[PDB]
Design a protein around this ligand. Structure first.
Ligand SMILES: Nc1ncnc2c1ncn2[C@@H]1O[C@H](COP(=O)(O)OP(=O)(O)NP(=O)(O)O)[C@@H](O)[C@H]1O
Ligand SMILES: Nc1ncnc2c1ncn2[C@@H]1O[C@H](COP(=O)(O)OP(=O)(O)NP(=O)(O)O)[C@@H](O)[C@H]1O
Ligand SMILES: [Mg+2]
Ligand SMILES: [Mg+2]
Lengths: 20, 860, 858, 11
């Protein structure tokens, strides 16, 4: 299990973007 | 654990009788009801997220708090049920809503906090539709209905809604987004919706994270994968998203672990140049992200859409099917040699180079390295073996390659329908892939059910010896007519089934779904077509007529002809008439009689034009002066404001997804208005409507040539030929304005439109009246009726051959697919009812076209 | 005085096109629609009151304000429409609603105040159901729905409602008094206080003359009449109220003018002690009141109710038809000596005295004084001339007296149906009257078509001994069967009519709509009855079935068998089964599947017992094990409680006839529960149900003797013999228990019950299954089938003849009254389809009773 | 007809 996600960071995720 | 109803039932039955709240299950829920708690009709509800093992532990953890107050609540039936419910596949917004809790408004505010602290540390997905209390606990809350109340929309479909203090319905619908209502606050923290500026300049704020800027790129579910820009490089990157505990396997493998499998496979393919490189992997809070390289701007799906088909040996430089096959299997051989199975090679997962336009593979979500194996397949492109999660084989990849090539050669996927045994019949694909692409037999072998045959075909490909196989036509009508006869028979039985399913209420199950009555989708169109057939079908039609008449009673509605009441009235009156049933006529008498000064819409689909046409149909039926009076009111109120709509599209650009229809089309644009005013001028002969008829017909002809050249382009799409939106509707209007106004110009325009449609036919996705082949064939045999050319008859026969070649269930049992592609429905415009209409008139060309031509003799 | 629709239309259309609004006309309203205003679904609306004479100017002063702000409004179509509207015989809740205005909340209070000052000094019928802006103006406002939203009530009926911020429905009753929503503030006051504060008061009263009203002797019509104690004299008196401009005659004559007519007539009758005497006449604001000496309690109508009928002279001391007739005629002739024609001489206007000289008259509102007579007539008792408003006549009064007698002698009024030519046919009355009473021929002579015969019979009364006429005898048997055939045929076609009116929505208007679907009154019962007949009727039943399936989808329901979904499902399923229609079975398959964890009622009408019987019917039809499971759940839920211990604890508390039903009767009490339990034991044969059955049957036979005592008594109220509440239901349950349990004492209870019923049959106020003769005859042929007697066959045939002779219309084309004597409808329990069910089973004895028995075809 | 008596009264 050397494939780990890596450090948590502060996320700015808010809403959906674009239209594809 | 993935427990069943029994374990959850036990853990519930414990304390439940401790407070004496008797339990029962419906649909997918196991609910307990306090006798002292009267459940209101809407309010703030509490959703607890969880997963199977966490579901049993969650039930236990939550009981303390919930039974401490007066309230009602529902629990998921099982961990298999919660598995489907936590899968992106069906409902993307109702994932994680494992437990729903309805208490009293004041009680909510504290109860949520207590449940949070007592469930602190329990894990489950994130509920995008709700606000959450605390990021350590799986507790969320929303405002929504508690009883399933529906109101009708401008489409004619029925929508879950909540009610404001003035009794106005509001789609409280879960849109994978939470919105608090203006009247009630937010029990945990008071709040409001829109900022201080009102109807003033607005600038939405969206930005990336650590060092990636984003740009959309996928619809929903497991993860909204994004196109992006790398700020510390300003290179373009692609970012795959995984949401925790979504798509959780029976082994506990969730979407994040699928992403890790993809990263691992990409590493195993690190030395291939046509496979993505993994740049970075990062998690944020509860969302995992895999950042790989940008590998071209267009998938094969999009590329075959906008750049045409892949044809035999020569043809344009990019578009050589044999080149495509060779490149794909070279790459596939490389991958296989590296001990990896793609498992999901489909037109959306091959990206062509921006310069050379060479295939590259992406999406290794379900790819195989070690032998646990991930479940997952793509309808129509994956082999059946994969549908039954059988051991992945090289020949699976060969099959999906055959299917990808099938699409590249025809522009639509191999026909695959849920529940159909014929799904993977190679002769079925043969009928659609009619020898085109040069190689055909080779690709039919790639799709052969015997895996050895697929190996032999891939051998042909690597060797360069491709097989070029053709297709045969139908015996001088006798067998073609036998096929049509059987098609209509079985479609009729299928319609009895769909009608029963409609009237029994099954599809009302969906939260926020369906219209049971109107012409477009509901019973009206179904039954109108059912009337033209045998006595059993006419019995079913009488049933549907009474059913709709009662259903319509004492509920809110819309006045449309395709969305609303006018079509319903036409259907009920027509059924009463042909059946000889005076009570149906009485039921229809008061139906479609709107204000009209309220209607602002002017198009065939929902306003004035369609209302006027429907009122004229009713008048020709009933000799009801109010009906002709209403049609005349329609024309009168339609001549008031021609000018403004033409010149109101300046900031929107061309592409004309809306513009071609909303300006010219029959459904939403002025072809339908032309049609109506022609109908009115026939009915009355008014001098004012005649002027507008000439004006609109002239403008139609003015704007037609660019549309015709658009349809004849490689870039052209089915939209261009559709009856609702493009050429078929315009041609159908002009075929009639010609005839009736003695214009040669109009009929010639119709002929050219018809021919463009003839060339776009095989590429059409849907088979339906609004969006597919049946509308085209209807224009064809319309022109036949108007100008006994009989060449149009041959054209319509070609359309029917296509329709039949695209049905499921073989000839004896055709079943034609929906606008959903993978299932059928009985609706008229978007389903099997309209297909039957067309196949019916093919043997009765004298009969009038429905909703366009008025009632007539030798046609019922 | 009364504008036309075109004068109004001109006055409106002028300015309205000035603000860009459009007029469309529907119902009795001319609605002008602003296109820029979006009408919310409920809220604060404003009503303006006016009179035909003042409607035109009301619109005048109105248009400025209404057209200034965005809003929607409706104006009564014409002056005759407004007259209808301000008459109480029409819609008592819609008096004064001349103009209705729907504006934006923000604009309500202002718009209201403006119009108020802008009208002011104008006069119209006060609106009790609204609040008032200013007491010098005709402007009012209330909170109500703006669009017909209908929700279901516990009766299965549909009523208009508004929705609160939690989405809960609330009957926005326009008829009832003003109503304050807890969630929205009075736009003018600015506060939200309810009126449930002071409903505790034993009385409040305090009239303008300082008179203490205690109870109200009806509130119907233009005015309400109250019982007063009086404070000065403190001797009890009756007070009649008049409301301004309510019931405006074509000559501008008001309710207050009618009350003054009463004062004048009473003044002229001052020397007689059998007339109320005027005592006081006062007013305030625009409400008027007239106070007269109280003569006694209980009117003649009530007298024949709580006491008995009037019969031949050698009869009980109070009861002497000839005595009553002669006393009435002496008082009447005294009145005639003064002119003053009574015109409304009806059992409700004769108040009885504790003395032997009982008869006294108490209301001469529309009486004759001068030649401009007042219009007004009481159905059935008033002569045809008076409906046509022929000049006041002594012979008309003689007709009304001859009907007052007739009621006194038969307990019910002459059959009279709105729209019926046969209305005053005197031989039709002869059939209802079988010669009972001394002056039978005299009663018929007073009801003759020729006034000369009425005059001759009145003089015959006066001369001495009265004419005693025997019944019109039926010399035929087979021809009676022909009449039965005619009744069924015509009722079938009449059903077709009611069904068409039902499914096309004609009767859906109103602040309350009868259930259009369920058994009791809606489609289900209609179609169930129509199924038993020939293929036109079976076809209509199929149409009704599909229509019900559609109407039922995606709206509120109730689980009832009689009120709700279980009977609906029974009907849809059975229609599918008989017609050979599989999709009807698929439509019924998911219908009645409630949670029994809720449902706090135990009841054939709306509760576990009826749910169980219906699920057993569904099961026997569909062979669906979930249906049997639901029946089992109903029985288990019934058995868990111990109703019988609470019966044996406190048995005869609050004892009156109505009380009997809620305890013992089939509809709401033990008899129906017992019917269900017997059915469950028949279906399964479990011991627990049989024990429960025995306990309940014993608890029934225990309490039957007192109920039979009351049912054989002088009072002899109809509810005692009704199927829904009294002996027909109990007997119908016990015939079946004593059959299936081989208990002969049960059968004996049924036989004695049937006997009591047969005694009350003639006095029964209805022909229908729930409350009238149909249930009785249904019991009778139950007993015939169960006990090969045939004497019960004769009993049922008698009841059939009674129904026939009390029917409306002709002999070959009859129509039957519903629960509202001058009306016809298709309701099964309360209307014509049930009557048909009985008349049909009369010709097919070995056929099941609907809902009470299981079905069997082949 | 004519006449009526007005006394302040209560509501
Ligand atoms: N490396 C890449 N280069 C170019 N385009 C890409 C790349 N990766 C993804 N795309 C595009 O963006 C989409 C990403 O979705 P994809 O990687 O296929 O996973 P997905 O959408 O979740 N399908 P699935 O994993 O089976 O649910 C693809 O359909 C391509 O159109
Ligand atoms: N002095 C009185 N004694 C007893 N009852 C009285 C007396 N005066 C009036 N009544 C009541 O009057 C009722 C009959 O009708 P009444 O109250 O006089 O007004 P009404 O029904 O409106 N008459 P009408 O306008 O012709 O329909 C009976 O129910 C009596 O109780
Ligand atoms: Mg993909
Ligand atoms: Mg009276």
């Amino acid at each position: 299990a050397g494939a780990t996600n890596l450090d948590a960071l502060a996320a700015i995720k808010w809403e959906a973007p674009a239209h594809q | 654990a993935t427990p069943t109803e029994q374990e959850l039932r036990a853990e519930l039955t414990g304390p439940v009788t401790g407070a004496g709240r008797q339990i029962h299950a419906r649909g997918v829920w196991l609910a307990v009801d306090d006798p002292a708690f009267h459940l209101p009709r809407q309010g703030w509800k509490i959703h607890l997220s969880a997963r199977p093992a966490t579901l049993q532990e969650t039930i236990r953890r939550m009981l303390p708090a919930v039974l401490a107050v007066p309230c009602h609540f529902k629990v998921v039936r099982s961990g298999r049920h919660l598995q489907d419910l936590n899968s992106a596949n069906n409902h993307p917004g109702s994932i994680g809503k494992a437990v729903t809790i309805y208490p009293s408004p004041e009680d909510v505010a504290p109860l949520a906090r207590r449940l949070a602290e007592d469930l602190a540390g329990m894990a489950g997905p994130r509920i995008c539709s709700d606000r959450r209390v605390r990021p350590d606990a799986p507790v969320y809350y929303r405002y929504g209905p508690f009883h399933p109340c529906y109101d009708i929309n401008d489409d004619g479909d029925l929508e879950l809604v909540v009610t404001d203090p003035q009794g106005n319905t509001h789609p409280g619908a879960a849109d994978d987004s939470f919105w608090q209502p203006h009247w009630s606050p937010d029990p945990l923290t008071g709040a409001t919706p829109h900022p201080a500026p009102s109807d003033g300049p607005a600038a939405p704020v969206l930005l990336g994270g650590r060092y990636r800027v984003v740009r959309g790129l996928t619809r929903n579910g497991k993860g909204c994968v994004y196109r992006a820009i790398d700020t510390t490089d300003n290179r373009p990157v692609i970012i795959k998203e995984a949401r925790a505990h979504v798509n959780e396997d029976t082994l506990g493998r969730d979407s994040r672990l699928r992403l890790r499998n993809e990263r691992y496979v990409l590493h195993l393919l690190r030395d291939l140049d046509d496979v993505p490189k993994v740049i970075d992997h990062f998690r944020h809070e509860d969302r995992e992200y895999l950042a790989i390289t940008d590998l071209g701007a267009l998938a094969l799906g999009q590329d075959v859409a906008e750049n045409g088909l892949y044809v035999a040996d020569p043809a344009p430089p990019g578009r050589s099917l044999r080149a495509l096959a060779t490149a794909l299997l070279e790459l596939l051989d490389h991958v296989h040699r590296r001990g990896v199975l793609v498992r999901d090679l489909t037109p959306t997962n091959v990206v062509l180079d921006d310069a050379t336009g060479r295939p590259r593979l992406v999406d290794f979500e379900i790819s195989h390295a070690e032998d646990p194996q991930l479940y997952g397949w793509t309808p129509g492109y994956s082999p059946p073996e994969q549908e039954r999660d059988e051991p992945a084989t090289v020949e699976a990849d060969y099959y999906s390659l055959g299917a990808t090539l099938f699409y590249a050669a025809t522009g639509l996927p191999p026909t695959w329908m849920t529940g159909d045994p014929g799904n993977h019949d190679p002769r079925r694909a043969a009928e659609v892939l009619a020898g085109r692409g040069g190689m055909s037999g080779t690709i039919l072998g790639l799709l052969d059910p015997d895996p050895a045959r697929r190996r032999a075909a891939a051998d042909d490909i690597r060797a360069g010896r491709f097989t070029d196989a053709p297709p045969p036509p139908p015996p001088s009508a006798r067998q073609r007519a036998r096929r049509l006869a059987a098609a209509i028979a079985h479609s009729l039985t299928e319609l009895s089934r769909h009608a029963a399913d409609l009237m029994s209420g099954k599809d009302f199950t969906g939260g926020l779904v369906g219209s049971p009555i109107n012409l477009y989708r509901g019973a009206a169109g179904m039954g109108m077509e059912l009337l033209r057939h045998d006595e059993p079908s006419r019995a079913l039609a009488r049933g549907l007529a009474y059913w709709t008449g009662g259903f319509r009673a004492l509920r809110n509605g819309r006045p449309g002809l395709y969305t609303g009441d006018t079509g319903i009235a036409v259907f009920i009156a027509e059924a009463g008439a042909t059946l000889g049933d005076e009570t149906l006529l009485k039921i229809a008498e008061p139906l479609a009689r709107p204000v009209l000064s309220r209607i602002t819409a002017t198009d065939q689909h929902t306003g004035l034009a369609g209302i006027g046409t429907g009122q004229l149909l009713l008048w020709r039926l009933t000799k009801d002066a109010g009906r002709l009076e209403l049609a005349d009111a329609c024309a009168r109120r339609l001549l008031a404001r021609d000018l403004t709509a033409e010149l109101q599209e300046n900031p929107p650009d061309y592409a004309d997804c809306g513009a071609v229809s909303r300006t010219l089309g029959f459904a939403h644009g002025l072809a339908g208005i032309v049609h109506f005013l022609r109908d009115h001028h026939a009915a009355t002969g008014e001098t004012a409507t005649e002027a507008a008829l000439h004006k609109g017909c002239d403008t139609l002809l003015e704007h037609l040539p660019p549309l015709l050249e658009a349809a004849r382009a490689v870039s052209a799409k089915p939209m261009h030929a559709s009856f609702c939106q493009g050429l078929a509707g315009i041609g159908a209007a002009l075929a009639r304005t010609g005839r009736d106004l003695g214009a040669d110009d109009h009929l010639q325009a119709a002929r050219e439109a018809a021919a463009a449609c003839l060339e776009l036919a095989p590429r059409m996705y849907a088979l339906t009246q609004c969006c597919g082949l049946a509308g085209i064939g209807e224009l064809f045999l319309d022109l036949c009726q108007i100008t006994g050319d009989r060449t149009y008859a041959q054209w319509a026969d070609r359309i029917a051959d296509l329709i039949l070649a695209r049905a499921g269930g073989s000839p004896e049992a055709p079943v034609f697919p929906d606008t959903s592609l993978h299932g059928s429905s009985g609706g008229w415009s978007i389903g099997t009812s309209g297909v039957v209409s067309f196949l019916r008139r093919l043997g009765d060309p004298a009969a009038p076209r429905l909703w366009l031509d008025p009632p007539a003799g030798t046609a019922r």
